[PDB]
Design a protein around this nucleic acid. Structure first.
Length: 124
DNA sequence: ATAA
């Protein structure tokens, strides 16, 4: 089956670049990662760090997830991230997204052994 | 509207 760990890597990691290239970064990346297969996923964030640097967050600041669950962690440092949100003019199948590149703390939720990010929760 |  697809593991939550691998699903986090496919939807939120993009190590190759240190930042979002074009305003169109999100329209290609969201389609190539398949987040527009059945519905356009309205918000999604891509982290531009090493798998090792993002994984490591699971051993840092324990904080509450946005929904009340105790298993979220935030990076001590700020990380390169591209937030992607679908615009008012987006209409499946041709999902349109707005690309924002920012450097800030990510908050991820973690599970398992190894204790890996499993969900992207917020940045701050 | 970002995890099952």
């Amino acid at each position: 089956k697809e593991t939550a760990a691998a699903k986090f890597e496919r939807q939120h990691m993009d190590s190759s670049t240190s930042a979002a290239s074009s305003s169109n970064y999100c329209n290609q990346m969201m389609k190539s990662r398949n987040l527009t297969k059945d519905r356009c996923k309205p918000v999604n964030t891509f982290v531009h760090e090493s798998l090792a640097d993002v994984q490591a967050v699971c051993s840092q600041k324990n904080v509450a997830c946005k929904n009340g669950q105790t298993n979220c962690y935030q990076s001590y440092s700020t990380m390169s991230i591209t937030d992607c949100r679908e615009t008012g003019s987006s209409k499946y199948p041709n999902c349109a997204y707005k690309t924002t590149q920012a450097n800030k703390h990510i908050i991820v939720a973690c599970e398992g052994n190894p204790y890996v990010p499993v969900h992207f929760d917020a940045s701050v």
